[PDB]
């Protein structure tokens, strides 16, 4: 599914991501924009042979099982495929674990490089939240 910007902001808010670990909703929308362009089916193969899945490009090295990332963990206790669903529940629940792991949203390189320090409220401007 390709979400609209406000559509995704709504879904994220309903699943409790807004201000989670102190990160306002626009941080999460900005991260999704640059990670996946709001497409839940996004995948990206990394140099190390791990893969990133879904709206927030969550990685198989630590967070989900794909059966093809030797040595990895599955800390969200899900198949990576769950992260490609039209329903973002799995992705949000897992993101909450990631953002709690010590580095906040710096876990998402793209957030650090493209969202951090920017006017992230723009990503929710106009949404009926």
- From the annotation, which residues make up the binding site? 101
Using CB under 5 A as the binding rule, whether residue 79 contacts Cl ion is answered as no
**59: contact with Na ion by CB under 5 A:** no
The CB density around residue 39, as the number of other CB atoms within 10 Å, is 15
* Only segment of 8-16, 31-39, 83-91, 121-129 that touches Cl ion (CB under 5 A): 121-129
Q: Longest C-alpha distance within the chain, in Å?
A: 44
- H helical segments located in 5-62: 5-14, 25-36
Q: Which stretch binds Na ion (CB under 5 A): 19-27, 67-75, 85-93, 103-111?
A: 67-75
Binders of Cl ion among residues 12 to 71 (CB under 5 A) are 24-26, 67, 69
Q: Does 60 bind Na ion (CB under 5 A)?
A: yes
Which one, of 126, 128, 121, lies nearest residue 19 by Cα?
Answer: 121
């Amino acid at each position: 599914k390709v979400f609209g910007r406000c559509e995704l902001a709504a879904a994220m808010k309903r699943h409790g991501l807004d201000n989670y670990r102190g990160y306002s909703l626009g941080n999460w929308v900005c991260a999704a924009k640059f990670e996946s362009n709001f497409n839940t089916q996004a995948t990206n193969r990394n140099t190390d042979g791990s893969t990133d899945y879904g709206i927030l490009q969550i990685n198989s090295r630590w967070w989900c099982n794909d059966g093809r990332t030797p040595g990895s963990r599955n800390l969200c206790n899900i198949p990576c495929s769950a992260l490609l669903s039209s329903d973002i529940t799995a992705s949000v629940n897992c993101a909450k674990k990631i953002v709690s792991d010590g580095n906040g949203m710096n876990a998402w390189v793209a957030w650090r490089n493209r969202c951090k320090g920017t006017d992230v409220q723009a990503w929710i401007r106009g949404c009926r939240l």
